Design a protein around this nucleic acid. Sequence first.
DNA 1: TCTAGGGTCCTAGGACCC
DNA 2: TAGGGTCCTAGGACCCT
Length: 342
Amino acid sequence: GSRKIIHVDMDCFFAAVEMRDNPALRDIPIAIGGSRERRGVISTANYPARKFGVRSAMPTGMALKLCPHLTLLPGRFDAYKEASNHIREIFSRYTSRIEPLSLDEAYLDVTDSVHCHGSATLIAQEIRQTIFNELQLTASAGVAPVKFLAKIASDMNKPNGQFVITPAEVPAFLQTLPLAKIPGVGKVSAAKLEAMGLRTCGDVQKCDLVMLLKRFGKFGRILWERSQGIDERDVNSERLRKSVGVERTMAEDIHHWSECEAIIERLYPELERRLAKVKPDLLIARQGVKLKFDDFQQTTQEHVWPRLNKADLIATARKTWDERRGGRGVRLVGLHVTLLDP
DNA sequence: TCTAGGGTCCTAGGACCC
DNA sequence: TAGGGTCCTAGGACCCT
Ligand SMILES: [Mg+2]
Ligand SMILES: [Mg+2]
């Protein structure tokens, strides 16, 4: 009983939308990201910019040093949300078994699909073609028997391509697969694994589950499982958002409580507006604040609270400011709510 | 170069309950 | 009756763009 999992992933999503809506941007290096003066980072870049080394999460000052002609865009999030809604509606034409992971990607379980003669390869191709036909954006896709391999596979033939891993091909694929390619294995984990001589899934296959469990806890079981292609996580179409946050990094650090309070006055109506979209009565489980300091340590303090309330967020930020700032500049202020459970 | 803003999930100590 | 359970909370790795 092998499943058929597709992972669909839009190509250079934000930049692809901006190029479609303004073809003057198609052939020059562009990126969505905050300006160097706004102390921004790159959200994403198109391929002309990626050629210079520009990457997501790169500080904008670095991207502009690599690519002096980089054209920087602020982002049009309703445009991306509209594209997201459209591709999820296209997914629904093939299956209801859809787990979105972000605006531009989703897992599909097409095990029980009768479309395209049961071929997940052809379903993926048809989805990608339909997306191009109806949105004039391209997507890539990965097909595999489990989630994480499908998600890895969708990167292998990007842009505008796809890659299929059959069960017969899984062992050879895993043997030299870098651990850092597994979603959830990030820089810190890959470095700790590298330092004990573990770089690939083939390396972890030579390890004892008990050792990994002592050395990493539950993460060690996930590493053990993924390194032999085990991933029983079902595609789940019923996940719901659990939190809403609004935060801003200032162009210059602030050093005075008056400046912090003034920023919160701007953030609060935005938090209220976004909460009201999903919870019109503003009823919540917790609310709280975030400060990030000029040396990049960050603190959050949140608490049980029944309904979004500005004065309590200001009061809480004042306590955090007085108690934890230690004369440092503050580069970021944020507000936060935790939503009621169901 | 100088480090975003939207989030999910896991950990772990103490409070609290029995 | 010596420890078994379950929330509150802060922090941090990690994910997407
Ligand atoms: Mg993408
Ligand atoms: Mg994606």
